Ligand binder design. Structure first.
Ligand SMILES: Cc1nn(C)c(C)c1NC(=O)CC#N
Ligand SMILES: [Cl-]
Length: 115
């Protein structure tokens, strides 16, 4: 069901190695809906190549645009299981401290802060 369940550790590592080779300036991001989530839709895909210069504030804007949300729908983004201390950090920095061992950066979204 989840990305980690669909692909072996070996497979996730090799995909990150190919994104490095073919899209060297991009951060490999996995973005999943919270399994509890009732309100927001599911994304059209799971794996995203994010330009390494955008900060987390701009990534939230990007995902809200991809979900085609309106001004008063709530959106919370967990990175590596937890709240972001700051949305102003460049995703290149966030990646280096919050990447998984497989080399993806995992994110989950919900309409409640209580996931
Ligand atoms: C071929 C290889 N063997 N081992 C053991 C490692 C770390 C590698 N590196 C990559 O391929 C990284 C990338 N991209
Ligand atoms: Cl690139």
């Amino acid at each position: 069901k989840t990305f980690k369940q669909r692909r072996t550790f070996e497979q996730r590592v090799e995909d990150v190695r190919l994104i490095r080779e073919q899209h060297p300036t991009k951060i490999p991001v996995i973005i999943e809906r919270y399994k509890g989530e009732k309100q927001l839709p599911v994304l059209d895909k799971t794996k995203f190549l994010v330009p390494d210069h955008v900060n987390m504030s701009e990534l939230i804007k990007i995902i809200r645009r991809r979900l085609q949300l309106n001004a008063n729908q709530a959106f919370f983004l967990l990175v590596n299981g937890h709240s972001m201390v700051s949305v102003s950090t460049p995703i290149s920095e966030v990646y280096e401290s919050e990447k998984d061992e497989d080399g993806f950066l995992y994110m989950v979204y919900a309409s409640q802060e209580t996931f």
